[PDB]
């Protein structure tokens, strides 16, 4: 058994950033404020790691630099939310949100003053991954797809190459499906369901963003965000909420 040849999904796996811990001090009572703040700090570090990740993705670096920033800006929440759901589904069958194996939102923390209002959507994606029993390869392809799930309504300076790459990973998602199932009929159903999950991702992101922007623009709440997130959020805030952006979908409503 010696393939000694890398596949597109094989390279997508070795570049998958390793889980990072929030270095949260849980030796003292919790509080909504402190947890959201630590998670934000973690978010910045994860997005930073997401940048090196995106750069290692075959074909991403050869797109205009402006588009590289556009994609990461337009999907940082989807990428993180999807990754979170993945770890939660894996670590506790989507029962507990596992932001990082050392910082998990247990039932006790889930009942804090504002925890559930916002975590419910994160739990949603985690639940779906469990329901569909998504494999590692399928997960990898889908996450890459979320990075290419939306672009500005008009196009990117390298739209041409973009659609080509996106196509390659849509087919990459197909390959993962075929070698995990066993039959052929439920292969297309699989693809249908998985692509449906990606589509719904846009909506889950919208709710997470609203909340993110809300808490970002209200210091009476006092929640802090690190450099990476603060910088990105400030940029997106306006252009986002309105709806001047094109969300790519596999299934039209």
């Amino acid at each position: 058994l010696p393939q000694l040849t890398p596949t597109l999904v094989s390279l997508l796996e070795v570049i998958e950033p390793e889980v990072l811990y929030a270095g949260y001090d849980s030796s003292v009572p919790d509080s909504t404020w402190r947890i959201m703040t630590t998670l934000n700090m973690l978010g910045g570090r994860q997005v930073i790691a997401a940048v090196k990740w995106a750069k290692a993705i075959p074909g991403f670096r050869n797109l205009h630099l402006d588009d590289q920033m556009t994609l990461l800006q337009y999907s940082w929440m989807s990428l993180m939310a999807f990754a979170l759901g993945w770890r939660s589904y894996r670590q506790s069958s989507a029962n507990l949100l596992c932001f990082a194996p050392d910082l998990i939102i247990n039932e006790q923390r889930m009942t804090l003053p504002c925890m559930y209002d916002q975590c419910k959507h994160m739990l949603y994606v985690s639940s779906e991954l469990h329901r569909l029993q998504v494999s590692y390869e399928e997960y990898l392809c889908m996450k890459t797809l979320l990075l290419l799930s939306s672009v500005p309504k008009d196009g990117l300076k390298s739209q041409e190459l973009f659609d080509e790459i996106r196509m390659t990973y849509i087919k990459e998602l197909g390959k993962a499906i075929v070698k995990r199932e066993g039959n052929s009929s439920q292969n297309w159903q699989r693809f249908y369901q998985l692509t449906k999950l990606l589509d719904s991702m846009h909506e889950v992101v919208e709710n997470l963003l609203n909340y993110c922007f809300q808490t970002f623009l209200d210091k009476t709440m006092s929640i802090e965000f690190p450099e990476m997130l603060a910088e990105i959020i400030t940029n997106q805030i306006p252009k986002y909420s309105n709806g001047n952006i094109k969300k790519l979908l596999f299934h039209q409503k």
């Binding site: 940048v51 090196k52 750069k55 590289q68 920033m69 450099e227 990476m228 910088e231 940029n235």
Partner: peptide, 21 residues
């Protein structure tokens, strides 16, 4: 045309250019 809030993602660009090691 116009687009206030220019030079808003300076850090992100930096991270995308470097690399090698």
């Amino acid at each position: 045309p116009v687009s206030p809030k220019k030079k808003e993602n300076a850090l992100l660009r930096y991270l995308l250019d470097k690399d090698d090691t």
